[model samples]
Target chain A: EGSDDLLLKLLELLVEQARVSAEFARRQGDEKMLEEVARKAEEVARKAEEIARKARKEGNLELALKALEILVRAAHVLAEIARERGNEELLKKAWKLAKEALRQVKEIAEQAQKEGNLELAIIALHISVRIAEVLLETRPDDREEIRKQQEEFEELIKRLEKQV
Target chain B: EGSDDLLLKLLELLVEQARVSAEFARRQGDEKMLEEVARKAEEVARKAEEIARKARKEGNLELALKALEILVRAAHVLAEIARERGNEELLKKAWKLAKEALRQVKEIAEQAQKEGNLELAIIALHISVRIAEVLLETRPDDREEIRKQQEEFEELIKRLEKQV
Candidate 1:
């Protein structure tokens, strides 16, 4: 667990660096460099997912969801940049990654509930709703599904909030 | 440790400079160029996978493992580029990409194991071992546990290889 936190500390710094690098790239008109950063961000998101996998495997559900949060953050950063550039392809990529992170969050929350970590479970569903809002910007045709997803998260959050 | 280290190891400044470069790339808005820059990684990896599988279908586990190693290392190369540029952010991103590289290689190995092709699984695990080893390099003060964790794969790899 200590090691997980340490690695996470480093990862926290690493994602921030992505933001720093992205900002720098934006200032210089460096498309190639930004592309490189985008690719890197995608990879880190995947890495964060793996971290959560191993963490949850060991009953570290809290840490596991934290790992998922990092993955979501990585995707969010790229999505922000993509929006700025009006790059639909990149936006779609980030959106998909975010959705995947949302899935991982819910899975962890499920485990959290089984283990009686109702508080942590609430924390995770909170993430779920935010993910919906982001990708909710797209998927106009599937608006009902996302809206429904958000409503479910809200419902769950309200019930859980009553519990704790 | 290398010639790239000196000339005033002002990493903050170096990182700042790298960011500016990244920002400039963002401003270019030359979606055509950026898309190619981004897609090239997939292009290279796809070609490498095909080449590796070509050798694999010929019953050449050796060539396949080597090919996969080359593919994963290509991701590491980007990390070194980030390091030299003093962009810690990019460095983290590159390693995350390398982690996914591990995933793809392990995926193949998992398939081979399920199919009872222990030889292929062993070699693929060996490749995973190597990639996991490089990833450990970036983890400061917390490498030992990770190494022990990684050793689990190699031990199993050896156990599987013994079957042949």
Candidate 2:
């Protein structure tokens, strides 16, 4: 519990630092600086995701979800920065990270789905679709792969659709 | 004749200016400066394409192709700048512009294709596919659209495949 608390605190500090740096770069009208800051933010997000994965492995589903939530929020901020700068490459990176966050969420949702936690699964699926919308925009060339993923989502969504 | 000579001269000047600025920025590690230079180069390339379009309209196929060649060479230079600086956003922009140059080539290739220029069409398509790889990596979300485009390519390619 103490280690979890420390992890949360460190993640918060890193996320906050990333935001401040990005904002400063924006104020300066420095695209490269903003990109560098965005890279740092992504690095922090990756660390958080790694912690979330470890937590999930240790059977701490709730803690894992919380860490992922922090990463998702951070990614949203970076995505906004990328869009405002019209940096499609950075936007793509941010979206990919958000998708990863949703993936973790999906894992939890799948567990809930099997345990008959119908409400949680439905809610997670809603967010999952939203992430997919943004993530798919950056990967237009992977049609075959995307087609497969879309089918998978459709099946799960339909399953939940029937349940609801 | 005089107008064509003047256009060629201006193209040379603009391309030279862009290269110098990019090299200076590269040496200085100034990404912003390099991007600025790249923008100037793209502007000139667009102007060259306009001239090429006018030549095509006038049925001066040779002149049009030459103009397109100039633009393609300039795009390759700017792409190198983006690559040296590791600027993916700018890199994508350069590749997209390069793709546009090829798009113009495609227009010419279509004419050649109709006249039994199967080899020309195949070559243009190969470059198109190559550029698509880079461009698509920069934009991952348009699976349906990309699928449509790919199908179009497949149709054209298949038709050519049968002919050759």
Candidate 3:
């Protein structure tokens, strides 16, 4: 019987289904359940990391980095939960990593930007905006303070616009 | 030899012993012990809360709020433990409440800025700085963003220099 194969296939199906359910739950504001799902996803990510570590120990750098990359993305999913909950500590950690990721995004985007890539600039700025929004949302206490600084940052972006 | 009184007396002695132990724990940066003492303090705080709730239900809002306030302040006995652990979440929550409690500080500072009361404004600014430093320390990833904003805020405070 193909029952074992079928179970594996069903598991793959179930995972995507869970991810979709989690997204809909988030939109419907079922945060408690969404949090549970996010926690589960985080656990899955930990297992992925274990696999990744083993891969690296067995001399598979590519697989290890790939696993790490997935871990980073899973962290972002956790960050989204933080953002939704307004969990300031989680938001702060999220912002830090997101910013670091953007530094990586920029490295890739710069060459495209230099080649007169408006699409690349738009993509990079979109990531920038998302990071900035998370930072802003977490600092609800300091709206006016951020407003004053964002004024200057806006100017910096404008300078980039001028360069383009 | 009332049992309740005897129990309280024992607890009193226990608290004194724990306080000495907590001090040593703090100096050693003994997180596990500090956590235990903090847990004990929290347990005591919860008992106080039960009384506070009953007071509120009996129309003693003043006493209830006072009890809560006292419970909050009591937790500060382990502030160094919390700070050293970089447990930003705890400090951030405390700061949030402190800001709410310090409206007069904000009002006075605003009035000082309006009336050219630079000296008074400076006083309020110090409090602001202290609060912001803790907030920032707890979320230092926001350091670059905040540093930019702090400059503009400091400049505003300086403008009052000429008037005061």
lDDT per residue as tens, model 2, A1-164: 55564555445544554554465456557788787767767877787788788888997766776677667766766776686577888787886786687667778778767778787666556656655554565555756545644765676777877777
lDDT of 3 at A6: 45
Tens digits of lDDT, candidate 3, A13-65: 44455467677887888978877866665564565456545654665433444
Q: Give candidate 1 regions above 4 Å deviation.
A: A136-142, A161-164, B1-164
Clashes of each: 15, 9, 0
The i-RMS of every model, in angstroms, reads 19.4, 23.3, 29.1
Query: For residues B1-164, what per-residue lDDT tens digits would candidate 3 score against the true structure?
Result: 13222223222323333344455455566779777765665554454445445655665433444444433443443343357556755555444433332343344456567767576566655655554454454445656545643663576576776674
Query: What would the TM-scores of all predictions be?
Result: 0.47, 0.40, 0.28
Model 3 misplaced stretches (Cα beyond 4 Å): A1-36, A39-80, A83-89, A139-164, B1-164
lDDT of 1 by residue, A14-49 (tens): 777887898888889998878888888877888888
Docking verdict class for candidate 2? incorrect
For model 2, what is the error of residue A4's alpha carbon versus the real structure, in angstroms, after optimal superposition?
2.5
**What does DockQ give for each predicted structure?**
0.01, 0.01, 0.01
